[PDB]
Design a protein around this ligand. Structure first.
Ligand SMILES: COc1ccc(-n2ncc3c(=O)n(CC(=O)Nc4cc(C(F)(F)F)ccc4Cl)cnc32)cc1
Length: 290
């Protein structure tokens, strides 16, 4: 348990940002956290209710996972309930909201032009999320719920991967509630995950595949035209998501790389990150003709 601790007195809650059923999130000022900044803004998750153990496991895990494109964890405040986890504040919030609000069905601020994000803007986002997934597959860590609702966008369109309990509330429609405890992101899962309940690196590249589709559809729900049971039938019957208008055939091919029926046929995430980075850093003259 080599988790950083922060004194309660160094955390000033400002207001709420989000509610789940296991946690509340707050904007807070945090003091003496960085020398660069004597004071600075963070998001703080307060535990609602076993629960303490889950909190200790979450904190140990998030102290392990550090990387440019994983949500930055600063540490815990264990001095009095509510127990707090302290996170970097991501000014644009979740990538799904960010996509929807820069999509044809939505103006231009500080980090972004008005109107649809450009192809180069969408490859940059896809690249960063892939960079994140490399680092997790690196550690042989299976995510199990990769989707735009579980990434955050910071100042400068820095995109980072998380896994938020509040996602099951805010975005319940993205989950199939089985039995009455469990919640399955069926629209993001490959056939082996739905059929055999196996979760692997390779079930995560499938999910990354669908993230790529979300990016290029500006955050539409995959199979939005289908019920949860229709999506299951269609995913088990091998039916593949259509190329979005904004998706060049060359990007659609990376998606197909992630959707090979056979887990082992799927391109590695390293390969995909490489394909996507290369495009995002390609000169406009090359991209304007893709
Ligand atoms: C506006 O700025 C905001 C807004 C919201 C937030 N915010 N809200 C909730 C959470 C939260 O739970 N975490 C921890 C987390 O993501 N945990 C995790 C990560 C992984 C892995 F994907 F990294 F691998 C796996 C498993 C778990 Cl449990 C972080 N930030 C949250 C933060 C800033």
């Amino acid at each position: 348990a080599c988790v950083h601790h922060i004194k309660r007195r160094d955390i000033v809650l400002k207001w709420e940002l989000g509610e789940g059923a296991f946690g509340k999130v707050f904007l807070a000022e945090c003091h003496n956290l960085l020398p660069e900044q004597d004071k600075m803004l963070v998001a703080v998750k307060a535990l609602k209710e076993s629960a303490r153990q889950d909190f200790q496991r979450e904190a140990e895990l998030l102290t392990m996972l550090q990387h440019q494109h994983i949500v930055r964890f600063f540490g815990v405040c264990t001095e009095g309930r509510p127990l707090l986890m302290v996170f970097e504040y991501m000014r644009h919030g979740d990538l799904n909201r960010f996509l929807r609000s820069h999509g044809p069905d939505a103006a231009g601020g500080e980090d972004v032009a008005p109107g649809p994000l450009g192809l180069g803007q969408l490859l940059a986002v896809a690249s960063q999320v892939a960079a994140g997934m490399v680092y997790l597959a690196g550690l042989h860590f299976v995510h199990r719920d990769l989707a735009t609702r579980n990434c955050l966008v910071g100042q400068g369109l820095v995109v980072k991967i998380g896994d938020f309990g509040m996602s099951r509330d805010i975005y319940s429609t993205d989950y199939y509630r089985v039995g009455g405890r469990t919640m399955l992101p069926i629209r993001w899962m490959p056939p082996e995950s739905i059929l055999y309940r196996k979760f692997t690196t390779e079930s995560d590249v499938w999910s990354f595949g669908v993230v790529l589709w979300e990016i290029f559809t500006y955050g539409k729900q995959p199979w939005y035209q289908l019920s949860n049971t229709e999506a299951i039938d269609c995913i088990t019957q091998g039916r593949e998501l259509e190329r979005p208008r904004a998706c060049p055939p060359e990007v659609y091919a990376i998606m197909r790389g992630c959707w090979q029926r056979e887990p082992q046929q799927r391109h590695s995430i390293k390969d995909v990150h490489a394909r996507l980075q290369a495009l995002a850093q390609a000169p406009p003259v090359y991209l304007d003709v893709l």
